Symmetry: D3
Subunit: 135 residues, 6 copies
C-alpha cells in the first residue's frame, strides 16, 4: 500500500534557522494502522524538490526522516560551493529510508536543520511517501 503527505506552502513559506533538527510541518505519515506488525516494512521517500538556504558562510540545509520516538532513519543535505552565493539557488533534494513496522511507531516524519547559521526555506511543493509491503 501507499501512504503519502504533501505540502505546497507558496502563500505561507516555511523556514528554519535551527541548528538542531526540527519537524517540517505537514510532512508526516500516520502509520498507526500498520504498527506492531513485524512482517511489514516501509520504504520511505522524502522529496523536497525546490529548497534553498540563505546566508553568508557556505549556506545549506539538512534533512532527516525520523520516527515519533525520535529515531533517525536517514539524513542528508545540500550546500552551496561559494561562501556568499549571489542568489541562493534551488537545490533539489530526495532522501530514502527503510523502516520495519514491528514497533509501536505511530508516525514517520520529516525534519530539517540549518548549516553554518543559514536559514533554510521551502515555498513550494514537497512530499513524504512510503510503500508498505510484507517481508
Amino acid at each position: 500500500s501507499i501512504v503519502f503527505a504533501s505540502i505546497d506552502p507558496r502563500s505561507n513559506p516555511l523556514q528554519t534557522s535551527s541548528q538542531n533538527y526540527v519537524d517540517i510541518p505537514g510532512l508526516k505519515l500516520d502509520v498507526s494502522k500498520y504498527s506492531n506488525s513485524p512482517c511489514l516494512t516501509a520504504l520511505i521517500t522524502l522529496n523536497i524538490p525546490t529548497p534553498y538556504a540563505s546566508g553568508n558562510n557556505f549556506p545549506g540545509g539538512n534533512f532527516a526522516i525520523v520516527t515519533d520516538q525520535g529515531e533517525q532513519l536517514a539524513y542528508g543535505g545540500f550546500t552551496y560551493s561559494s561562501k556568499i552565493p549571489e542568489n541562493s539557488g534551488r537545490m533539489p533534494f530526495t532522501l530514502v529510508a527503510r523502516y520495519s513496522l514491528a514497533s509501536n511507531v505511530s508516525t514517520i516524519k520529516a525534519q530539517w536543520s540549518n548549516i553554518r547559521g543559514s536559514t533554510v526555506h521551502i515555498d513550494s511543493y514537497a512530499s513524504i511517501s512510503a510503500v508498505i509491503q510484507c517481508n
Copy 2:
C-alpha cells in the same frame, strides 16, 4: 505493479526555452489499463538525474508531473546561484507525486519549462515511473 518509461537522448538531445509547461518527449506513462480503479493509487517518480540550464539571468529549469487532462500533480525546479554561471553544471532533480486511479485519465506525463529566459537541457538518461498499489 510497476509502470516505467525512460529516455536516453544522447545522440539527439532535448531542450526547451518554453515559458509554459510542455511535455518532455518520451517521458509518459500509459495507465489506461488501470483507469477508473477506485481502490488503487500510483506513486509517481520523475527522475532527471543530469539536467542543466543555459542562460544569463540566474538560469534554471522547472518540472512537473501532469495528467492528460492537464492536472498538475507536482512541480519543482533547480536554479544556479550565479547570474551567469561559468559552465552550467549538472543539477540532479527528482520529483514525487501521488495519483488516485479513480479517474478516467489514460496518461501521466512529465512536463518542463524555463525560467528567466533560460534553456533547459536533457542529453542523457531520465525516467518516469509509478508503483501502483491497492489502498489496502
Copy 3:
C-alpha cells in the same frame, strides 16, 4: 517486496578518482530469490556527495547488474571551474529491471569526471520495489 541496503561512512569516508565505473562498497541488493521470473524498480539515493578538483569537478553514478548491464546513469557537476568549497549536491537515480534473466545482484557504481575525486561521507542507500507485472 522491498530490498534495501544503506551505508553511513562517517568514520571511514569513501572516495574514488576512477575514470571507469567501480562499485560503491555496501550499495548492493541481493535479488537472487527473484531471478528467472517480476520487475524491480531500483532507486539509488546519494543525498550528500561532493567532488573535489579544479576543472569543473563532479561525479557520475550508475545502477548495474552483475551481468554488467548498465540500467541507468547520471551525475552532478559544479558551475564554477574551481569551486571555493565543493558543495553537497543531492543525487537520486531510478532504474527498472525485468527479473526474467539470471541476475543475482543489482548494485551502485561511481566514477569521476575531469580528474575529480568523488566523496561519500554520510548516509546513502539503494533500494528496490519488486512487483508482479
Copy 4:
C-alpha cells in the same frame, strides 16, 4: 489474506434436528478488521467432509453460509437415495460463497438444518475459510 476456523468434535459430536437453520458452533470467521471496506471481497469455503444424517424418511442435511446480520450467501445439502438407509454413510460436502466487505458485517458463519425430520451429525474435522482480496 486468509481467514480460517476449524472444528474437530471427535470427543463431543455435534448434532441438530432443527428444521430451521441454526449455527454450527465454532465454524465462524471474524472479518471485523476488513469490515466497512468496499474495495475488498471474500471468497468463502465451508468444508464438512464427513457428515451423516440419521432418520427414516430419506434423511439428509442442509448447510448455509450466512452473515451476522442473517443474510444467506449460499446453501446446499446432501440426501440419501433410500427411505431408510441401512447405515447412514458419510456424504462429503463443500459450499462456496462470495461476499463484498462494504457493509459493517462482523462475522461470516456456517449454519445447518435437517430434512424430513432427520438428525444431522458432525463428529470429525470440518472447516470454514476465506480468501480476502482487493477488487
Copy 5:
C-alpha cells in the same frame, strides 16, 4: 483477485440428458482482462445435484476454457441400479489454468451417464483466485 459467478435456479430448474458435455448456463467466468499474462485456481461448486434414471444414474461435470480445453472433470453416481429417490450428492471440482494464452472465458459443463437426466435446482457457483506466480 477473485472472479465469481453463481446461479440459483429454483423457479426454473436446469437439466441435461446430453451425453456430450454442454455448458451449464450462468456458470461462466470472464478472465478477459488477465489473458496474455498469472495463474487461475478455479473451483466449481455444485452442492446439491441429483440424477434420475434406471441404470446406475449419475452426472459428470467439467471445467473448460473457450479454447475447448478440458482442465478438469469428475462426477457422481449412485450405488443402486434404480435409486428409490435419487439423492443429493454434493460435488466440487478444482482446476488450474495458466493465463499465458488468449483465453477469455472459463466455464462449467455437464453431461449425463447411462442415459440419466442430471438436475440442478438450487445454488451453485464457479469461482477463481487469480494470482501472480
Copy 6:
C-alpha cells in the same frame, strides 16, 4: 501465489487397501521455496471428485492432508449406506486445510486409507492445491 498438482491415472488407476494412511501417488505440493516464511499461510484443498470404494462391510475411503514431518492437517472420508453396495458409486470428496509456512516443511501431500477392509480407487482426475497469501 498458487501451487498445484494433479493426476489423471486413467490408464494406470490407483488403489489402496492400506489400513494406515499412505501417500496418494502424485498428489504432493512442493512448498520448499516458501519454507520458514513467518508471514505466510497456505490454504490447501484436496479435490478427489470421482473416487469409489469396493468391499462388503459398508465400504468407504479416508483422506488426509499431511506434511513431510507426518503432521496431519485435516482428514475426512466417504462411506456408503449399504453393507454391500450393488455397484460402488462415485462419491465426490473435497478437504480443506490451513498451514502456516512458519516451518521447515518442504512438502504437503495427500494421503488415503481404507475402512472395514475396503479398497479405495482413483481412476480419473484429482488435484491438490494451495493459495499462499501474506497474513496481512
